[model samples]
Target: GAHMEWKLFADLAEVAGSRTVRVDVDGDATVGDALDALVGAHPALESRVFGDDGELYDHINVLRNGEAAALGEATAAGDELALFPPV
Candidate 1:
Protein backbone atom coordinates (compact mmCIF):
# COMPACT_ATOMS: atom_id res chain seq x y z
CA GLY A 1 0.00 0.00 0.00
CA ALA A 2 1.17 3.51 -0.71
CA HIS A 3 2.26 5.53 2.25
CA MET A 4 -0.38 8.23 2.24
CA GLU A 5 -0.13 11.18 4.54
CA TRP A 6 -3.05 13.50 5.26
CA LYS A 7 -2.80 17.10 4.17
CA LEU A 8 -5.09 19.79 5.47
CA PHE A 9 -7.29 21.47 2.88
CA ALA A 10 -7.44 25.19 3.43
CA ASP A 11 -9.42 25.96 0.28
CA LEU A 12 -12.63 24.57 1.78
CA ALA A 13 -12.09 25.76 5.29
CA GLU A 14 -15.47 27.44 5.14
CA VAL A 15 -17.13 24.03 5.14
CA ALA A 16 -16.16 23.84 8.74
CA GLY A 17 -17.33 27.39 9.05
CA SER A 18 -14.04 28.17 10.68
CA ARG A 19 -10.37 27.35 10.32
CA THR A 20 -11.05 23.82 9.18
CA VAL A 21 -8.29 21.32 8.54
CA ARG A 22 -8.38 18.76 5.74
CA VAL A 23 -5.97 15.96 5.04
CA ASP A 24 -4.73 14.84 1.63
CA VAL A 25 -4.87 11.19 2.53
CA ASP A 26 -3.30 8.39 0.52
CA GLY A 27 -5.31 6.28 -1.89
CA ASP A 28 -8.16 4.11 -0.60
CA ALA A 29 -7.89 5.08 3.02
CA THR A 30 -11.20 4.94 4.89
CA VAL A 31 -12.70 7.63 7.06
CA GLY A 32 -11.53 5.64 10.04
CA ASP A 33 -8.03 5.64 8.61
CA ALA A 34 -8.24 9.38 8.16
CA LEU A 35 -9.46 9.79 11.72
CA ASP A 36 -6.57 7.69 12.92
CA ALA A 37 -4.19 9.84 10.94
CA LEU A 38 -5.69 12.93 12.51
CA VAL A 39 -5.39 11.49 15.97
CA GLY A 40 -1.86 10.36 15.22
CA ALA A 41 -0.94 13.88 14.25
CA HIS A 42 -2.73 15.36 17.23
CA PRO A 43 -2.36 12.98 20.12
CA ALA A 44 -4.79 15.14 22.05
CA LEU A 45 -7.54 13.88 19.77
CA GLU A 46 -7.06 10.21 20.62
CA SER A 47 -9.74 10.12 23.31
CA ARG A 48 -12.00 12.31 21.23
CA VAL A 49 -12.30 9.92 18.29
CA PHE A 50 -12.04 6.54 20.01
CA GLY A 51 -12.23 5.23 23.48
CA ASP A 52 -9.80 3.07 25.50
CA ASP A 53 -10.98 0.02 23.54
CA GLY A 54 -10.69 2.01 20.35
CA GLU A 55 -14.46 2.17 20.02
CA LEU A 56 -15.85 5.35 18.55
CA TYR A 57 -16.57 7.97 21.12
CA ASP A 58 -20.22 8.64 21.80
CA HIS A 59 -19.89 12.35 21.24
CA ILE A 60 -18.30 11.86 17.83
CA ASN A 61 -20.06 11.78 14.50
CA VAL A 62 -18.65 10.75 11.09
CA LEU A 63 -19.97 10.80 7.54
CA ARG A 64 -18.73 8.89 4.51
CA ASN A 65 -20.22 8.91 1.01
CA GLY A 66 -22.93 11.12 2.45
CA GLU A 67 -23.88 8.29 4.80
CA ALA A 68 -23.03 8.14 8.44
CA ALA A 69 -20.12 5.75 8.91
CA ALA A 70 -21.14 3.20 11.55
CA LEU A 71 -18.93 2.77 14.57
CA GLY A 72 -16.43 0.38 12.98
CA GLU A 73 -17.33 0.39 9.33
CA ALA A 74 -14.68 1.22 6.74
CA THR A 75 -15.16 4.55 4.96
CA ALA A 76 -15.82 4.91 1.26
CA ALA A 77 -14.29 7.44 -1.17
CA GLY A 78 -17.46 9.36 -1.93
CA ASP A 79 -17.75 9.66 1.82
CA GLU A 80 -17.46 13.15 3.23
CA LEU A 81 -16.27 13.05 6.83
CA ALA A 82 -17.42 15.71 9.22
CA LEU A 83 -16.95 16.25 12.94
CA PHE A 84 -18.53 18.93 15.09
CA PRO A 85 -18.06 19.09 18.81
CA PRO A 86 -20.90 20.41 20.91
CA VAL A 87 -19.65 23.35 22.85
Candidate 2:
Protein backbone atom coordinates (compact mmCIF):
# COMPACT_ATOMS: atom_id res chain seq x y z
CA GLY A 1 0.00 0.00 0.00
CA ALA A 2 1.09 3.52 -0.73
CA HIS A 3 0.82 6.55 1.46
CA MET A 4 -1.72 9.01 0.15
CA GLU A 5 -2.94 12.39 1.25
CA TRP A 6 -6.62 12.66 2.05
CA LYS A 7 -8.14 16.09 2.01
CA LEU A 8 -11.06 17.06 4.18
CA PHE A 9 -13.27 19.45 2.37
CA ALA A 10 -16.54 21.25 3.10
CA ASP A 11 -17.89 20.52 6.56
CA LEU A 12 -15.29 17.88 7.30
CA ALA A 13 -12.52 20.38 6.80
CA GLU A 14 -14.32 22.84 9.05
CA VAL A 15 -14.84 20.11 11.59
CA ALA A 16 -11.15 19.24 11.42
CA GLY A 17 -10.35 22.93 11.28
CA SER A 18 -9.52 24.21 7.81
CA ARG A 19 -10.81 24.33 4.23
CA THR A 20 -8.63 21.60 2.80
CA VAL A 21 -7.00 19.41 5.38
CA ARG A 22 -4.57 16.65 4.48
CA VAL A 23 -3.82 13.38 6.25
CA ASP A 24 -1.60 10.47 5.38
CA VAL A 25 -3.55 7.24 5.01
CA ASP A 26 -2.63 3.79 3.83
CA GLY A 27 -3.48 3.46 0.17
CA ASP A 28 -5.18 0.12 0.60
CA ALA A 29 -7.01 1.11 3.76
CA THR A 30 -10.71 1.14 3.24
CA VAL A 31 -12.75 4.26 3.55
CA GLY A 32 -13.84 3.12 6.97
CA ASP A 33 -10.25 2.86 8.10
CA ALA A 34 -9.42 6.29 6.80
CA LEU A 35 -12.47 7.70 8.49
CA ASP A 36 -11.43 6.04 11.70
CA ALA A 37 -8.10 7.77 11.57
CA LEU A 38 -9.78 11.08 10.85
CA VAL A 39 -12.24 10.79 13.70
CA GLY A 40 -9.43 9.58 15.94
CA ALA A 41 -7.60 12.81 15.35
CA HIS A 42 -10.79 14.76 15.91
CA PRO A 43 -13.18 12.90 18.11
CA ALA A 44 -15.45 15.88 18.06
CA LEU A 45 -16.42 14.89 14.54
CA GLU A 46 -17.79 11.57 15.74
CA SER A 47 -21.28 12.89 16.34
CA ARG A 48 -21.40 13.96 12.75
CA VAL A 49 -19.15 11.26 11.37
CA PHE A 50 -20.85 8.32 13.03
CA GLY A 51 -24.42 7.14 13.02
CA ASP A 52 -26.69 5.34 15.49
CA ASP A 53 -25.38 1.99 14.27
CA GLY A 54 -21.92 3.27 15.23
CA GLU A 55 -21.06 3.19 11.54
CA LEU A 56 -20.60 5.93 9.04
CA TYR A 57 -22.60 8.57 10.77
CA ASP A 58 -25.57 9.99 8.94
CA HIS A 59 -25.78 13.56 7.72
CA ILE A 60 -22.24 13.14 6.47
CA ASN A 61 -21.27 12.21 2.94
CA VAL A 62 -17.92 10.85 1.84
CA LEU A 63 -16.40 11.14 -1.59
CA ARG A 64 -13.46 9.49 -3.24
CA ASN A 65 -11.41 11.66 -5.54
CA GLY A 66 -14.56 13.60 -6.42
CA GLU A 67 -16.78 10.56 -6.77
CA ALA A 68 -19.59 9.61 -4.42
CA ALA A 69 -18.96 6.30 -2.74
CA ALA A 70 -19.72 4.37 0.40
CA LEU A 71 -17.43 3.60 3.33
CA GLY A 72 -16.23 0.59 1.33
CA GLU A 73 -16.03 2.21 -2.11
CA ALA A 74 -13.41 4.64 -0.89
CA THR A 75 -10.08 3.20 -1.87
CA ALA A 76 -7.22 4.34 -4.06
CA ALA A 77 -3.48 4.17 -4.51
CA GLY A 78 -3.26 7.75 -3.27
CA ASP A 79 -6.85 8.73 -2.84
CA GLU A 80 -8.02 12.16 -1.94
CA LEU A 81 -10.71 11.10 0.47
CA ALA A 82 -12.94 14.12 0.66
CA LEU A 83 -15.26 14.38 3.59
CA PHE A 84 -18.42 16.25 2.68
CA PRO A 85 -20.72 17.54 5.34
CA PRO A 86 -24.29 17.64 4.13
CA VAL A 87 -25.59 21.13 4.70
Candidate 3:
Protein backbone atom coordinates (compact mmCIF):
# COMPACT_ATOMS: atom_id res chain seq x y z
CA GLY A 1 0.00 0.00 0.00
CA ALA A 2 0.98 3.57 -0.66
CA HIS A 3 -0.14 6.93 0.68
CA MET A 4 -2.28 9.38 -1.26
CA GLU A 5 -2.63 12.99 -0.32
CA TRP A 6 -5.93 14.80 -0.63
CA LYS A 7 -6.41 18.50 -0.16
CA LEU A 8 -9.75 19.72 1.09
CA PHE A 9 -11.19 23.14 0.45
CA ALA A 10 -13.69 25.25 2.37
CA ASP A 11 -16.36 23.21 4.06
CA LEU A 12 -14.63 20.00 3.15
CA ALA A 13 -11.72 20.78 5.42
CA GLU A 14 -14.04 21.52 8.29
CA VAL A 15 -15.86 18.31 7.73
CA ALA A 16 -12.73 16.23 7.39
CA GLY A 17 -11.09 17.94 10.37
CA SER A 18 -8.13 19.10 8.33
CA ARG A 19 -7.14 21.06 5.25
CA THR A 20 -5.09 18.17 3.96
CA VAL A 21 -4.98 14.48 4.74
CA ARG A 22 -3.11 11.36 3.73
CA VAL A 23 -4.85 8.08 3.17
CA ASP A 24 -3.46 4.60 2.62
CA VAL A 25 -4.62 2.40 -0.18
CA ASP A 26 -3.40 0.18 -2.93
CA GLY A 27 -1.17 1.74 -5.56
CA ASP A 28 -4.02 1.54 -8.02
CA ALA A 29 -6.40 3.65 -5.99
CA THR A 30 -9.09 5.57 -7.82
CA VAL A 31 -11.11 8.61 -6.83
CA GLY A 32 -13.89 6.34 -5.72
CA ASP A 33 -11.42 4.23 -3.78
CA ALA A 34 -10.10 7.24 -1.91
CA LEU A 35 -13.62 8.38 -1.18
CA ASP A 36 -14.37 5.06 0.42
CA ALA A 37 -11.23 5.22 2.54
CA LEU A 38 -12.06 8.73 3.68
CA VAL A 39 -15.63 7.93 4.55
CA GLY A 40 -14.55 4.83 6.32
CA ALA A 41 -12.14 6.73 8.52
CA HIS A 42 -14.64 9.49 9.25
CA PRO A 43 -17.92 7.79 9.71
CA ALA A 44 -19.51 11.04 10.86
CA LEU A 45 -19.14 12.41 7.33
CA GLU A 46 -20.99 9.63 5.58
CA SER A 47 -23.98 11.86 5.01
CA ARG A 48 -22.06 15.09 4.77
CA VAL A 49 -19.97 14.32 1.70
CA PHE A 50 -22.17 11.68 0.16
CA GLY A 51 -25.86 11.39 -0.53
CA ASP A 52 -28.26 8.89 1.00
CA ASP A 53 -27.71 6.67 -2.02
CA GLY A 54 -23.95 6.76 -1.44
CA GLU A 55 -23.17 9.03 -4.36
CA LEU A 56 -20.87 12.02 -4.05
CA TYR A 57 -22.95 15.02 -3.11
CA ASP A 58 -23.82 17.15 -6.11
CA HIS A 59 -22.06 20.13 -4.58
CA ILE A 60 -18.62 18.56 -4.60
CA ASN A 61 -16.01 18.46 -7.34
CA VAL A 62 -12.83 16.38 -7.64
CA LEU A 63 -9.51 17.37 -9.19
CA ARG A 64 -6.42 15.30 -9.85
CA ASN A 65 -3.22 17.27 -10.21
CA GLY A 66 -5.27 20.44 -10.89
CA GLU A 67 -7.37 18.79 -13.59
CA ALA A 68 -10.94 17.61 -13.19
CA ALA A 69 -11.29 13.93 -12.53
CA ALA A 70 -14.29 11.67 -12.60
CA LEU A 71 -15.10 9.43 -9.66
CA GLY A 72 -13.93 6.45 -11.63
CA GLU A 73 -10.56 8.03 -12.34
CA ALA A 74 -7.47 6.19 -11.13
CA THR A 75 -4.52 7.74 -9.34
CA ALA A 76 -0.80 7.30 -9.72
CA ALA A 77 2.10 7.79 -7.35
CA GLY A 78 2.49 11.27 -5.89
CA ASP A 79 -0.60 12.53 -7.68
CA GLU A 80 -2.00 15.72 -6.22
CA LEU A 81 -5.71 15.97 -5.49
CA ALA A 82 -8.24 18.57 -4.54
CA LEU A 83 -11.76 18.14 -3.22
CA PHE A 84 -13.80 21.26 -3.63
CA PRO A 85 -16.94 21.60 -1.63
CA PRO A 86 -19.96 23.75 -2.21
CA VAL A 87 -20.04 27.21 -0.78
Candidate 4:
Protein backbone atom coordinates (compact mmCIF):
# COMPACT_ATOMS: atom_id res chain seq x y z
CA GLY A 1 0.00 0.00 0.00
CA ALA A 2 1.05 3.54 -0.64
CA HIS A 3 0.49 6.47 1.67
CA MET A 4 -1.05 9.56 0.12
CA GLU A 5 -2.49 12.86 1.20
CA TRP A 6 -5.98 14.17 0.51
CA LYS A 7 -6.81 17.86 0.49
CA LEU A 8 -10.43 18.76 1.06
CA PHE A 9 -11.86 22.09 0.03
CA ALA A 10 -14.91 24.15 0.85
CA ASP A 11 -17.66 22.19 2.50
CA LEU A 12 -15.77 18.98 2.00
CA ALA A 13 -13.28 20.16 4.56
CA GLU A 14 -16.03 21.03 6.97
CA VAL A 15 -17.64 17.67 6.68
CA ALA A 16 -14.47 15.73 7.09
CA GLY A 17 -13.40 17.98 9.98
CA SER A 18 -9.97 18.41 8.45
CA ARG A 19 -8.58 20.23 5.46
CA THR A 20 -6.03 17.52 4.84
CA VAL A 21 -5.92 13.83 5.64
CA ARG A 22 -3.62 10.91 5.01
CA VAL A 23 -4.74 7.54 3.72
CA ASP A 24 -3.24 4.28 2.61
CA VAL A 25 -4.15 2.83 -0.75
CA ASP A 26 -2.97 0.13 -3.08
CA GLY A 27 0.25 0.87 -4.96
CA ASP A 28 -1.71 0.80 -8.22
CA ALA A 29 -4.83 2.39 -6.77
CA THR A 30 -6.83 4.89 -8.74
CA VAL A 31 -8.25 8.18 -7.53
CA GLY A 32 -11.46 6.39 -6.76
CA ASP A 33 -9.62 3.96 -4.55
CA ALA A 34 -8.18 6.80 -2.54
CA LEU A 35 -11.63 8.30 -2.33
CA ASP A 36 -12.96 5.09 -0.89
CA ALA A 37 -10.28 5.09 1.75
CA LEU A 38 -11.09 8.67 2.63
CA VAL A 39 -14.77 7.97 3.04
CA GLY A 40 -13.94 4.92 5.05
CA ALA A 41 -11.98 7.11 7.40
CA HIS A 42 -14.59 9.86 7.51
CA PRO A 43 -18.04 8.43 7.25
CA ALA A 44 -19.69 11.82 7.36
CA LEU A 45 -18.29 12.60 3.91
CA GLU A 46 -19.98 9.66 2.22
CA SER A 47 -23.36 11.24 1.56
CA ARG A 48 -21.92 14.60 0.67
CA VAL A 49 -19.40 13.19 -1.76
CA PHE A 50 -21.56 10.70 -3.59
CA GLY A 51 -25.08 10.69 -4.94
CA ASP A 52 -27.90 8.24 -4.50
CA ASP A 53 -26.83 6.59 -7.73
CA GLY A 54 -23.40 5.96 -6.25
CA GLU A 55 -21.70 8.51 -8.53
CA LEU A 56 -19.78 11.54 -7.44
CA TYR A 57 -21.97 14.62 -7.36
CA ASP A 58 -21.74 16.72 -10.52
CA HIS A 59 -20.33 19.72 -8.72
CA ILE A 60 -17.56 17.79 -7.03
CA ASN A 61 -14.06 18.28 -8.42
CA VAL A 62 -11.08 16.01 -7.90
CA LEU A 63 -7.48 16.91 -8.60
CA ARG A 64 -4.37 14.79 -8.71
CA ASN A 65 -1.05 16.53 -8.43
CA GLY A 66 -2.77 19.88 -9.17
CA GLU A 67 -4.34 18.58 -12.40
CA ALA A 68 -7.94 17.66 -12.92
CA ALA A 69 -8.30 13.95 -12.34
CA ALA A 70 -10.87 11.28 -12.99
CA LEU A 71 -11.79 8.29 -10.90
CA GLY A 72 -9.80 5.98 -13.13
CA GLU A 73 -6.63 8.02 -12.82
CA ALA A 74 -3.84 6.09 -11.14
CA THR A 75 -2.29 7.30 -7.89
CA ALA A 76 1.22 7.03 -6.48
CA ALA A 77 3.06 7.54 -3.23
CA GLY A 78 3.49 11.20 -2.28
CA ASP A 79 0.66 12.02 -4.65
CA GLU A 80 -1.75 14.69 -3.52
CA LEU A 81 -5.46 14.34 -4.11
CA ALA A 82 -7.73 17.31 -3.69
CA LEU A 83 -11.50 17.22 -3.44
CA PHE A 84 -13.68 20.25 -3.87
CA PRO A 85 -17.36 20.46 -3.22
CA PRO A 86 -19.32 22.85 -5.39
CA VAL A 87 -17.05 25.86 -5.36
Could you tell me every candidate's TM-score relative to the true structure? 0.56, 0.72, 0.86, 0.95
| Candidate 4 per-residue C-alpha lDDT over 1-87 given as tens digits, one digit per residue, 9 for 90 to 100 | 899999998788999899999999998899999999999999999999998998999978899999999999999999989998886
Clashes of each: 5, 2, 0, 0
The candidate maximizing TM-score is: 4
Q: Of 3 and 4, which scores higher on lDDT? A: 4
TM-score of 2: 0.72
Superposed model 2: Cα runs more than 4 Å off? 9-11
In candidate 4, position 53 carries an lDDT of 95
TM-score of 3: 0.86
- Candidate 4 clashes between residue pairs 3 or more apart in a chain or in different chains: none
Global local distance difference test of model 3 = 0.79
**Model 3: lDDT of residue 44:** 67
Ranking by TM-score: 4, 3, 2, 1
lDDT of each: 0.53, 0.70, 0.79, 0.93
After aligning candidate 4 to the native by TM-score, how far in Å is the CA of 54 from where it should be?
0.7
Candidate 2 lDDT over residue span 1-87, tens digit each: 544455666666777786554455675678788777777777777877777789765557677777777887556666777777776
lDDT of 1 by residue, 36-72 (tens): 7666656666655566897876755465544556545
